Amino acid sequence: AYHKDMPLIFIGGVPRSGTTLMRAMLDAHPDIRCGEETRVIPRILALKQMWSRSSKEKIRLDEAGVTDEVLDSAMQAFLLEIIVKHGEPAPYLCNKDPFALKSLTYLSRLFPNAKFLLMVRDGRASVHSMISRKVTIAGFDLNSYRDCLTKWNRAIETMYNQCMEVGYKKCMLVHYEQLVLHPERWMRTLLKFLQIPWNHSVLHHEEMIGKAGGVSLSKVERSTDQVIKPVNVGALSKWVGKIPPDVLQDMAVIAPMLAKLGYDPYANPPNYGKP
Amino acid sequence: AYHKDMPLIFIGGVPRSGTTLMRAMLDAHPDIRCGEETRVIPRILALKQMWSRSSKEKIRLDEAGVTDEVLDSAMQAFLLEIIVKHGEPAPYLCNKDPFALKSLTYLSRLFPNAKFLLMVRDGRASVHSMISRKVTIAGFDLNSYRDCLTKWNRAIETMYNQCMEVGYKKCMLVHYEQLVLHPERWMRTLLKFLQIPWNHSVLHHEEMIGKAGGVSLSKVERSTDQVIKPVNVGALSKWVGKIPPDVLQDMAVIAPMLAKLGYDPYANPPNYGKP
Amino acid sequence: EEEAY
């Protein structure tokens, strides 16, 4: 049984911000299934967004009878079929595709009882991650820290503004650094936010890897080698000393979302906190 | 009521091949609704086609549980929501999007009882039409008859091959020239092929324009001003004398599909027949 | 489009 009013969970954020860890920890809950990145969801959502943004094209679709209500119904049907059928059934279905939250507000409209989790990491950590691990993302030039931080800023700002627009009952900012430093505190807050009862197995996601009602992984995903380990504070500040000095000097200008999201742009690194 | 096994009709072919006329003639049948070009259907089909052609990407989606069966279910749900909801309900639902039949074989698999009408027109007529009326198609350079006939050739070859692959019970080649020359003869053959009872109103499509259970037109579609008129043989050879002589000399080289489809590539024009 | 087709 599935439908557009069911309680869905959408995890996202900029890649390399702990999105796989977030969904793996929730997957470890026995009544929740998220599963691996679908990939198709961001692309069809981005396609749909290109049609609605062009007022010229929007007129042509409305004249063909392909209205907002028709498109939304087709979008709903497509996304649910993917979300429901690509993994095992569960009381609480979940979806993790980082850039799906670029259409957060639109997803909130399509799915009224859906809740969102925007993963937020220090942009310098996320950018250093994708550059050092050679993670290829559309638009992100991995030779340039300046370019990647500029694209990180643009991406995270768009998702943040939408997260804020829907409000504190539909979307929740989840700070990666805080998640790893205080995993019990945050997972308890998160499940209370999602209105799902507590289960301690979310704090042992490593012991649920490849288990029935557990954490399904993809051998070709870039976060698989890290998520199989237990939750640790190891990746908080691996970025420090690796960014060039001209970029470090311009950091607040390049990435003003660092400051908005509680990261000191001139701390090398910030004091994220300690457990 | 609607489902993936329902008897669908997909009209298509290269733009400027009499596809609007074809669908309008069927829309004049009181039991058939086709409606306006959806526009989204070819684009989502094309998007899907890119994922399945790429063997690298096909591995990743399957590793994420987004298998053919999952994708095909998602596509079925999306395409049916557009087809059913964008127009008024009818016993026999139809869809006209010219380039939807670049995924003819795939649509035949997704919709097992769907029947296909591939409209074929003399490529010199289609190309001349799109150039003289300035009808923009992606990849077609309207400043070159040579480039347009080459792209025409590639498009029609792809759709023709898929039409012949699915077989005579699933797909019917419909020659525009033969339709306009002998409209009663061909509409009778078409409705027998579609297994829909004969109704003379298909031959009076101009009297069903904008009527209930009749022909619904889009004010920004490029065939609207011609389709409001009754069937005529006036557009058979408007191209003659308008194609440059270098392209005329190279006709069989540029467009070998002309000859494959029964058109003489050096007759100006061919003897299409007389009413 | 986008183009007419």
Next chain:
Amino acid sequence: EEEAY
């Protein structure tokens, strides 16, 4: 792709 994200 296609890129990774």
